[PDB]
Design a protein around this ligand. Structure first.
Ligand SMILES: [Zn+2]
Lengths: 153, 60, 24, 120, 98, 125, 80
RNA sequence: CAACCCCCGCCGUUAGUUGCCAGCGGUUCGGCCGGGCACUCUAACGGGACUGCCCGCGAAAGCGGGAGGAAGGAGGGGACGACGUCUGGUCAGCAUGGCCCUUACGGCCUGGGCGACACACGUGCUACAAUGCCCACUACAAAGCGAUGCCACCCGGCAACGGGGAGCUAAUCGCAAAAAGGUGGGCCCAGUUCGGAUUGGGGUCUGCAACCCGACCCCAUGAAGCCGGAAUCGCUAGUAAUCGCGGAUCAG
RNA sequence: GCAUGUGGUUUAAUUCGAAGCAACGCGAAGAACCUUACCAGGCCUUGACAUGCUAGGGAACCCGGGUGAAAGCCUGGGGUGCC
């Protein structure tokens, strides 16, 4: 984008719950546009949360996201003929995106067989503040104030 | 196109497989369209002057 | 499975027909 | 669960199992169960000793297998080989036989890559 | 039940030609189903612009064979009069089967 | 009440008859013509828009395109017929934008390319 | 696994040329370009010279080599 | 440059052997028949956006936001490449100055070769699998091509194919099955029911002829390969990714 | 791993061009003979194609046989119009 900030695509809320956050997540599981498949994944992963936890998956989902949003990050920069990691306050937009993504990238790395399953567990261990979803979160920050020796750029 | 092969590729062969095309105009052999019987270059060539009827320039 | 010229897709790919993909 | 030739395919389905045998492919197996009535779905370990034998007796006295197949081919090769047959030569040279190209992708018949020097 | 097929290359040439059959058919005949389009079949030609070698060139040529139909039911010897030898289009081919 | 719903090369014959509340498409139960289809429910949205679910029947036909498009196709049609019943309905419809139709059409494959955009890859430029 | 349906091929050039060498017993040298041809059980024992791209390769035929063609004995590509 | 021209999206007129109980009568309940052009459609012409309206910024041009509208500010996509640049490419398409051969640097043919392989790079295809593979039942597409050509259907065969034979001159017959998808069931994380290389073997067809050097089918064989060094490509929306279909050339 | 283009090496020949971006599934939208320009061997010359000239013989034409890998070479027949 050179000329403008470019508008942000607006999505259609979920047919089930109705939260766009949902639709956003699903989009992220979907590969090859088999959105009918990824739809299921999410739902059946929800149903797993019902049977395995006394809580509404809708809530569980948000709180899980809420917890992996890193509020601090690195962004390399060439000053002095060198790569200086400048830590920086991440914007709202970029959090939500980084969350959902990591939730997924992490999920598919689980030892578990069935996909929906992998999501299910990742969605829980997330809200409990663990797993890897949150680890891929704490690690970035473990760089944020790790090189905070440079927050003057 | 060598005359030695235009006029040649025209006389009936001892085997039907042996019979290939050539462009009636240029004598080219590599890629003539049956429909017109002209070398791809040739097709364009006339296609342009307007010598191939109904033959317009596609647009969609 | 697309190179497996003895499977479903195997044939569908090559567009050939055989003991694996028939004519109904 | 044992021996067909000298082999022991086990703990899995029959149909699957039999594949393991040099002479049997996803075809014969099915056409060796259809000729015996043993239900494929059942594992090897849960076969009736009697069921087993039938399979045995059949398969062994019909198709050419391990201890004999590897043989027929082997010599079969030496056949045209002993003869000045082109096809034989390709076999000597360890190159493609069926007619492929010897400029690029051939590696499957040459094995590892043998890099040499050149120019620019 | 005179079936009149009209195949051509120019859509105006046929329109007129087709209209010309519509007009002198209602004056001496009876109830005409009007002119109807098909379909229309195209003949694409993907040729390389330059004669030398530039795959990425390619000029695109088409050839539209328009199809028009005009049905005439209750064919009189009077209708066949006006529609006997009263034509004018050149790049139009007609064929009748009744 | 007919309206006409067309979407990405696929036509939808829409018929709204005051009934109990059932959709028959190309002769089959709505929910049978769309098994396993997640966004299926999507068709009826224009209805639950005016709290008019179950008051009409839906004799719907459809031709062309894909099932995962025809959905939208019906969706529009229903909407277009819904004006015939009460034009005053626009007030609650267009804000939600159901009377719009998008040229989401499949772009033409240009030559020199592998698709409508996807160019070919060069390595040592 | 190659195949010529129903009716095995052999050019009449040598067929009715080699058979005539049967009416006399044996010969010594045969030369004909048709390497298009299959070898027949009716052809065994002769010493046919086949054409390469420039040479004329002599080929002795065996009781054991009836199912192959002539070309299969005339290597074209000179190598190594 | 823009515009005029085509395709796409709304709508109107003209047109009904495509389309339909949209409304009625019968059924072998197949829109099959009548009957009807309404709808879908088909195609030829024409309407429709111009920042024209409202708020704000602005000297103006214009910019931002809203509304009505199918569509918004060039609505999406085409064709469409200035004066010239690179002594760009191409005399093997054609044409043409010039030099060179004209019993040969010409012409016919048979066979071989363009397919050669210790290697190396370009473009790609198939895959490493469970968001998956297989088998089964089942549903939605467009745009093309078809006379000795597309081949319905029946029969023989595991099958490629073959024998028979109806329809089409093609919106009214055929290529045709779209595939992914959906329902069931099998697989249970293996180098495996992942993968299909290569090799043996047995066949089909084209065609004078498939050794060199053809595709196809069937049985067996079942390799590398468990996601790729440094480096490096494409793509800003119905795009990328994915999935199947069609044609050109052409016996194959 | 395989297809395909190219370098290079090879070959009797492996015909030719294209070369950084702006060559490399590029001419080639179809190499088994053919295509085909290459190499071998066999054969042909006013020549496979145009317009024409001077001398001699024959309507054109058609159907055989010999030799042959084919082409070609040799040979033999019937055959005789319009001015
Ligand atoms: Zn030409």
């Amino acid at each position: 984008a050179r000329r403008r900030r470019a508008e942000v695509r607006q999505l259609q809320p979920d047919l089930v719950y109705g939260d766009v956050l949902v639709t956003a997540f699903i989009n992220k599981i979907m590969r090859d546009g088999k959105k009918n498949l990824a739809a299921r994944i999410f739902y059946d992963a929800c149903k797993i949360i019902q049977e395995k936890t006394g809580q509404e998956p809708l809530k569980v989902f948000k709180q899980a996201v809420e917890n992996v949003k890193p509020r601090m990050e690195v962004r390399s920069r060439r000053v002095g003929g060198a790569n200086y990691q400048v830590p920086m306050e991440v914007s709202p937009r970029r959090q939500q995106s980084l969350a959902l993504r990591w939730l997924v990238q992490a999920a598919n790395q689980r030892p578990e067989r069935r996909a929906a399953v992998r999501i299910a567990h990742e969605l829980m261990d997330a809200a409990e503040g663990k797993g890897g979803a949150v680890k891929k979160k704490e690690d970035v920050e473990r760089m944020a104030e790790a090189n905070r020796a440079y927050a003057h750029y | 196109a060598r005359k030695a092969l235009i006029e040649k590729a025209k006389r009936t062969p001892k085997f039907k497989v042996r019979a290939y095309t050539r462009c009636v105009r240029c004598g080219r052999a590599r890629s003539v369209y049956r429909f017109f019987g002209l070398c791809r270059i040739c097709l364009r060539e006339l296609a342009h002057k307007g010598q191939l009827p109904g033959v317009r320039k596609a647009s969609w | 499975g697309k190179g497996d010229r003895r499977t479903r897709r195997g044939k569908i790919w090559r567009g050939t027909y055989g003991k694996y993909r028939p004519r109904k | 669960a044992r021996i067909a030739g000298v082999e022991i395919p086990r703990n899995k389905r029959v149909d699957v199992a039999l594949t393991y045998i040099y002479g049997i492919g996803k075809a014969r197996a099915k056409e060796a169960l259809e000729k015996t009535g043993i239900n494929p779905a059942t594992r090897v370990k849960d076969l009736t000793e009697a069921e087993v034998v039938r399979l045995r007796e059949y398969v062994e006295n019909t198709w050419k297998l391990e201890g004999e197949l590897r043989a027929e081919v082997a010599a079969n090769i030496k056949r045209l080989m002993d003869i000045g047959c082109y096809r034989g030569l390709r076999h000597r040279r360890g190159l493609p036989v069926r007619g492929q190209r010897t400029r690029t992708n051939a590696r499957t018949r040459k094995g590892p890559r043998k890099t040499v020097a050149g120019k620019k | 039940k005179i079936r009149i097929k009209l195949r051509g290359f120019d859509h105006k040439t046929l329109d007129a030609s087709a209209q010309k059959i519509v007009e002198a058919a209602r004056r001496s005949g009876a109830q005409v189903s009007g002119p109807i389009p098909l379909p229309t079949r195209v003949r694409r030609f993907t040729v390389i612009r330059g004669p030398f070698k530039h795959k990425d060139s390619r000029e695109h040529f088409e050839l539209r064979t328009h199809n028009r139909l005009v049905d005439i039911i209750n064919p009189n010897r009077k209708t066949i009069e006006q529609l006997m030898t009263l034509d004018l289009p050149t790049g139009v081919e007609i064929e009748i089967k009744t | 009440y007919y309206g006409t719903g067309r979407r990405k090369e696929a036509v939808a014959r829409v018929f709204l008859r005051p009934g109990n509340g059932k959709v028959t498409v190309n002769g089959q139960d709505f929910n049978e013509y769309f098994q396993g289809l997640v966004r299926a429910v999507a068709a009826l949205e224009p209805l639950r828009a005016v709290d008019a679910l179950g008051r009409f029947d839906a004799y719907i036909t459809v031709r062309g395109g894909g099932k995962s498009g025809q959905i939208d196709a019906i969706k529009l049609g229903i909407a277009r017929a819904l004006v015939q019943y009460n034009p005053d309905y626009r007030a609650k419809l267009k804000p939600l934008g159901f009377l719009t139709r998008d040229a989401r059409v499949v772009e033409r494959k240009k030559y020199g390319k592998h698709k409508a955009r996807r160019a070919p890859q060069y390595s040592k430029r | 696994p190659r195949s010529l349906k129903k009716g095995v091929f052999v050019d009449d050039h040598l067929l009715e040329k080699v058979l005539e060498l049967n009416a006399k017993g044996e010969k010594r040298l045969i030369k004909t370009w048709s390497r298009r041809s299959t070898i027949v059980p009716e052809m065994v024992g002769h010493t046919i010279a086949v054409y390469n791209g420039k040479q004329h390769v002599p080929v002795y035929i065996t009781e054991n080599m009836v199912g192959h063609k002539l070309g299969e004995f005339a290597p074209t590509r000179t190598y190594r």
